[PDB]
Design an enzyme around this catalytic site. Sequence first.
Site, PDB file in Angstrom:
ATOM      1  N   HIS A  68       0.838  -1.224   0.000  1.00  9.05           N
ATOM      2  CA  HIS A  68       0.000   0.000   0.000  1.00  9.05           C
ATOM      3  C   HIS A  68       0.868   1.267   0.000  1.00  9.05           C
ATOM      4  CE1 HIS A  68      -3.220  -2.892   1.193  1.00  9.05           C
ATOM      5  NE2 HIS A  68      -3.862  -2.161   0.261  1.00  9.05           N
ATOM      6  N   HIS A  72       1.696   1.590  -5.760  1.00 11.95           N
ATOM      7  CA  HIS A  72       0.277   1.135  -5.844  1.00 11.95           C
ATOM      8  C   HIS A  72      -0.639   2.283  -6.275  1.00 11.95           C
ATOM      9  CE1 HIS A  72      -3.412  -0.887  -4.887  1.00 11.95           C
ATOM     10  NE2 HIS A  72      -3.709   0.020  -3.967  1.00 11.95           N
ATOM     11  N   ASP A 107      -5.232   5.563  -1.064  1.00 15.62           N
ATOM     12  CA  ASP A 107      -4.618   4.816   0.088  1.00 15.62           C
ATOM     13  C   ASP A 107      -3.635   5.712   0.867  1.00 15.62           C
ATOM     14  OD1 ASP A 107      -5.702   2.118   0.316  1.00 15.62           O
ATOM     15  OD2 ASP A 107      -4.384   1.472  -1.314  1.00 15.62           O
ATOM     16  N   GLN A 269      -5.578 -17.646  -3.453  1.00 15.16           N
ATOM     17  CA  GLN A 269      -5.616 -16.855  -4.709  1.00 15.16           C
ATOM     18  C   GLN A 269      -6.793 -17.327  -5.573  1.00 15.16           C
ATOM     19  OE1 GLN A 269      -3.832 -14.020  -5.895  1.00 15.16           O
ATOM     20  NE2 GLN A 269      -3.564 -13.893  -3.670  1.00 15.16           N
TER      21      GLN A 269
HETATM   22  C1  LIG Z   1      -4.263 -10.355  -5.415  1.00 15.15           C
HETATM   23  C2  LIG Z   1      -4.977  -9.545  -4.390  1.00 15.15           C
HETATM   24  C3  LIG Z   1      -5.347  -8.250  -4.552  1.00 15.15           C
HETATM   25 CL1  LIG Z   1      -5.065  -7.446  -6.048  1.00 15.15          CL
HETATM   26  C4  LIG Z   1      -5.969  -7.493  -3.563  1.00 15.15           C
HETATM   27  C5  LIG Z   1      -6.241  -8.100  -2.414  1.00 15.15           C
HETATM   28 CL2  LIG Z   1      -7.112  -7.278  -1.172  1.00 15.15          CL
HETATM   29  C6  LIG Z   1      -5.913  -9.463  -2.187  1.00 15.15           C
HETATM   30  N1  LIG Z   1      -6.055 -10.276  -1.164  1.00 15.15           N
HETATM   31  C7  LIG Z   1      -5.473 -11.439  -1.590  1.00 15.15           C
HETATM   32  C8  LIG Z   1      -5.406 -12.616  -0.677  1.00 15.15           C
HETATM   33  C9  LIG Z   1      -6.308 -13.758  -1.122  1.00 15.15           C
HETATM   34  C10 LIG Z   1      -6.271 -14.898  -0.154  1.00 15.15           C
HETATM   35  N2  LIG Z   1      -5.126 -15.476   0.109  1.00 15.15           N
HETATM   36  C11 LIG Z   1      -5.139 -16.516   1.028  1.00 15.15           C
HETATM   37  C12 LIG Z   1      -3.941 -17.156   1.352  1.00 15.15           C
HETATM   38  C13 LIG Z   1      -3.945 -18.204   2.260  1.00 15.15           C
HETATM   39  C14 LIG Z   1      -5.129 -18.630   2.839  1.00 15.15           C
HETATM   40  C15 LIG Z   1      -6.340 -18.021   2.518  1.00 15.15           C
HETATM   41  C16 LIG Z   1      -6.337 -16.961   1.624  1.00 15.15           C
HETATM   42  N3  LIG Z   1      -7.503 -16.306   1.297  1.00 15.15           N
HETATM   43  C17 LIG Z   1      -7.569 -15.288   0.434  1.00 15.15           C
HETATM   44  O1  LIG Z   1      -8.635 -14.753   0.155  1.00 15.15           O
HETATM   45  N4  LIG Z   1      -4.946 -11.405  -2.791  1.00 15.15           N
HETATM   46  N5  LIG Z   1      -5.223 -10.117  -3.156  1.00 15.15           N
HETATM   47 MG   LIG Z   2      -7.275   0.829   0.433  1.00 10.17          MG
HETATM   48 ZN   LIG Z   3      -5.501   0.438  -2.846  1.00  8.16          ZN
END
Ligand SMILES: Cc1c(Cl)cc(Cl)c2nc(CCc3nc4ccccc4[nH]c3=O)nn12
Ligand SMILES: [Mg+2]
Ligand SMILES: [Zn+2]
Length: 313
Positions: A68, A72, A107, A269
């Site tokens: 952040h 970004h 942000d 992911q």
């Molecule tokens: C690519 C991306 C962007 Cl662009 C913005 C935000 Cl906010 C974001 N959050 C994640 C994390 C997703 C995510 N990883 C995890 C990893 C381990 C266990 C459970 C998880 N459960 C999840 O949901 N990837 N991501």
């Molecule tokens: Mg934000």
């Molecule tokens: Zn942002």
Amino acid sequence: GLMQFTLPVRLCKEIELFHFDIGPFENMWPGIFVYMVHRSCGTSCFELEKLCRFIMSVKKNYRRVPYHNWKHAVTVAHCMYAILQNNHTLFTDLERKGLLIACLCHDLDHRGFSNSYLQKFDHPLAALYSTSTMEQHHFSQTVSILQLEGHNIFSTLSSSEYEQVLEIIRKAIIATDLALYFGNRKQLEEMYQTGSLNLNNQSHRDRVIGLMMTACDLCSVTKLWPVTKLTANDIYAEFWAEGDEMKKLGIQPIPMMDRDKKDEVPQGQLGFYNAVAIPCYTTLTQILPPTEPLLKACRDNLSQWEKVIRGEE
Ligand SMILES: Cc1c(Cl)cc(Cl)c2nc(CCc3nc4ccccc4[nH]c3=O)nn12
Ligand SMILES: [Mg+2]
Ligand SMILES: [Zn+2]
């Protein structure tokens, strides 16, 4: 006012594409943003001296956190630039002005922690703003910088145009709270399908701009796979530090924030693409057909995470 910003030829051509990466040269990012304002808005939108002073105060108020950060901010503004340039005639002059600024500021003064961690820590911001905590702070930092001497880039607008642009920015920034995105997209899906969607209805435009803000904020998932993958490393560097801070408060963090559950990231992911990203770019593509490349790139990145799970990467 006869001073065009230009870019080297590769950047000049590739900046127009949704998958453009602004690169590792931090000193070029202000120039890249001015270039985008000049083309999406006009050389007349802002006084150069005021714009430049505003950009540099914005940069100074982003922190050196892994994800952040100032990179970004410019990345999210570029995705907005690409949406605006592919949908020339759908947006008002004030929307053109407001939205690139909203993206640059969305942000501001982020500390690398979620709304949820600020609430659990009992941070002063959580008492000042009970929901969308960081997003109310980012809008507040935006107004503070606009009020510094020589930083008011909107000074040429009437009182009501000024109130309209700050209202566009506030709503755009609040919409980047992903807790609000799910309901916003469901409402947009229903309105598009029942044919009730109407871009002369201000509260419909508001919802569409909100979705555009989510789409720009998530735009890491729409890049070339190596950009997507290396940005994911920065996202987790933040999440895992917050996970550490949760364990310091005596709280088991969610798996997404627990560095001891790295092995679960590829499946996390997949959930994220299926629950958040793909539906975001699907609805966006239905409302604004020329944004389809974002959906196509997102789906390519989902297929790459599927390859990571299958051990083909
Ligand atoms: C690519 C991306 C962007 Cl662009 C913005 C935000 Cl906010 C974001 N959050 C994640 C994390 C997703 C995510 N990883 C995890 C990893 C381990 C266990 C459970 C998880 N459960 C999840 O949901 N990837 N991501
Ligand atoms: Mg934000
Ligand atoms: Zn942002």
